């Protein structure tokens, strides 16, 4: 039995795609978003009178096992040195595995930091964080 | 073994 009226996304249900290639062995993606909501106050009451949006901000963080080939460094999406200055913005798509249908798009991603951890009883881990210009979904 | 658990009619 398979029902649509209730369903949740799961780690197996969702592809992560960059430039039309799926990202293998991605372990997590974390999207965070903030609007700077500021409350308005005045003489005459302690209550907030209004809220205003002032500054949009958001980041996408991805953890991945470091493959022997097609790393973020080998794919060119990450940067180790001054060549960060020569990487154009990229769009990261999170896509439904069954329907191949875009769930959410992060547009204009730009790398904040890049980590690699080499450890003796574990698989090596990449982690990367991007600032992005906006996010959207289409249906 | 005796027929306790499932019990069926006599043949006639």
């Amino acid at each position: 039995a398979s029902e649509a009226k209730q369903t949740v996304h799961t780690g197996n249900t969702v592809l992560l795609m960059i430039k039309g290639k799926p990202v293998g062995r991605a372990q997590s993606a974390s999207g965070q978003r903030e609007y700077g909501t500021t409350g308005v106050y005045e003489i005459g009451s302690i209550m907030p009178q209004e809220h205003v949006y002032l500054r949009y901000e958001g980041t996408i963080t991805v953890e991945r096992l470091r493959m022997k080939k097609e790393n973020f460094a080998d794919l060119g999406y990450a940067s180790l040195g001054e060549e960060i200055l020569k990487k154009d913005i990229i769009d990261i798509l999170v896509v439904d595995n069954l329907t191949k249908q875009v769930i959410i798009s992060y547009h204009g991603c730009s790398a904040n930091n890049y980590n690699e951890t080499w450890q003796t009883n574990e698989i090596v881990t990449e982690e990367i964080e991007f600032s992005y210009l906006t996010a959207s979904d289409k249906a | 073994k005796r027929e306790d658990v499932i019990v069926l009619q006599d043949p006639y």
């Binding site: - | 019990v7 069926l8 009619q9 006599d10």
Partner: protein, 49 residues
């Protein structure tokens, strides 16, 4: 055997656990049940309402 008797079992008859060939004793809280007030058919027990 023992059964609690309810409106469904009155209307439908109690399906007996055993294949009863004959009854040697039958009774209730009110006393013995007389043979005009019970019947067995198809290994179902029917009782006066």
């Amino acid at each position: 055997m023992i059964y609690f008797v309810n409106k469904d079992r009155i209307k439908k008859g109690i399906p007996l656990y055993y294949d009863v060939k004959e009854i040697t004793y039958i009774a209730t809280q009110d006393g013995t049940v007389y043979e005009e007030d019970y019947e067995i058919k198809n290994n179902r027990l029917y009782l006066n309402e």
